[PDB]
Design an enzyme around this catalytic site. Structure first.
Site, short mmCIF file in Angstrom:
data_model
loop_
_atom_site.label_atom_id
_atom_site.label_comp_id
_atom_site.label_asym_id
_atom_site.label_seq_id
_atom_site.Cartn_x
_atom_site.Cartn_y
_atom_site.Cartn_z
N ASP A 39 1.00 -1.08 0.09
CA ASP A 39 0.07 -0.12 -0.10
C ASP A 39 0.79 1.07 0.04
O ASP A 39 1.99 1.35 0.56
CB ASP A 39 -0.86 -0.03 1.24
N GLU A 83 -5.36 1.86 -4.24
CA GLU A 83 -3.93 2.30 -3.83
C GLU A 83 -3.10 1.18 -3.48
O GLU A 83 -1.98 1.36 -3.13
CB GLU A 83 -4.11 3.50 -2.87
#
Ligand SMILES: Nc1nc2c(ncn2[C@@H]2O[C@@H]3COP(=O)(O)O[C@H]4[C@@H](O)[C@H](n5cnc6c(=O)[nH]c(N)nc65)O[C@@H]4COP(=O)(O)O[C@H]3[C@H]2O)c(=O)[nH]1
Length: 164
Positions: A39, A83
C-alpha cells in the site's frame, strides 16, 4: 479484461483467480506460497500536494518497481485496490519474500533522490506465507497479509511487517 489500464499489471479478479489455482498447486507440491500486500503511504496527502496526475504517475512508478523485483514465471503482480498492490510469490519461502519486499520498499523510498521529478514517497508491505506443514486456509493466508500490512501502517509507515 485482465490488466489494469493505468499500471499495466494484472487486475483484482485475475489475482484472486490465479491465487486460487496457485493455492491447490502448493497443496500438492508442498512448496511455500508467499503473499505481499503493498500500500502507498500518505497517498491522500500526496494527491493534495501534487494533484491527481502525479499520484497516477506515482502508482505507475510503484508498479514498475515491483515488476522489476518480481520476475519469475510463477509470480503475479496485480492492482488489488485504488492504492494497493498484491503480488503472488509461488514457491518462495518467507525469508526470500522479505528480501523482495525490502528491495521494493528501499527502491520506492529512493525514487525521489534518483529522479528530480518524483516527489518523496514510501510504501508499507505486509507478508504472509503458507508452508507445507501449515494448516491455514487461503482466506487465512490473505487475512494475515492485510493484517501485517495494517500493522505496518500502525507502527509508523515505510516498513515491512511479516505475519505470525
Ligand atoms: N519469486 C521470486 N523470488 C525472488 C525473485 N528475486 C529474488 N527472489 C528471492 O530473493 C532471494 C534472494 O535473491 P537475490 O539476492 O537476488 O540472489 C539470487 C540471485 O542473485 C541468483 N539467481 C537465482 N535465480 C536467478 C535468475 O533466474 N536470474 C538471475 N540473474 N539470478 C538468479 O541466485 C540468488 C539466490 O536466490 P534464491 O536462493 O532463489 O533466493 C532469492 C529468491 O527466493 C523473483 O523475481 N521472484
Amino acid at each position: 479484461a485482465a490488466t489494469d489500464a493505468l499500471t499495466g499489471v494484472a487486475n483484482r479478479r485475475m489475482l484472486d483467480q490465479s491465487l486460487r489455482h496457485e493455492w491447490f498447486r502448493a497443496q500438492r507440491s508442498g512448496k511455500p506460497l508467499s503473499l505481499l500486500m503493498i500500500d502507498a503511504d500518505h497517498f491522500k496527502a500526496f494527491n493534495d500536494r501534487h494533484g491527481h496526475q502525479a499520484g497516477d504517475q506515482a502508482l505507475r512508478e510503484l508498479a514498475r518497481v515491483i515488476t522489476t523485483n518480481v520476475r519469475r514465471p510463477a509470480d503475479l503482480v496485480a492492482r488489488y485496490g485504488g492504492e494497493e498492490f498484491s503480488v503472488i510469490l509461488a514457491e518462495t519461502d518467507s525469508v526470500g519474500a522479505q528480501q523482495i519486499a525490502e528491495h521494493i520498499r528501499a527502491a520506492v523510498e529512493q525514487l525521489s533522490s534518483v529522479n528530480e521529478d518524483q516527489s518523496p514517497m514510501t510504501v508499507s508491505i505486509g507478508i504472509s506465507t503458507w508452508t507445507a506443514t501449515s494448516e491455514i486456509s487461503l482466506e487465512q493466508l490473505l487475512f494475515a497479509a492485510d493484517k501485517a500490512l495494517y500493522q505496518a501502517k500502525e507502527g509508523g509507515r515505510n516498513r515491512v511487517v511479516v505475519a505470525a
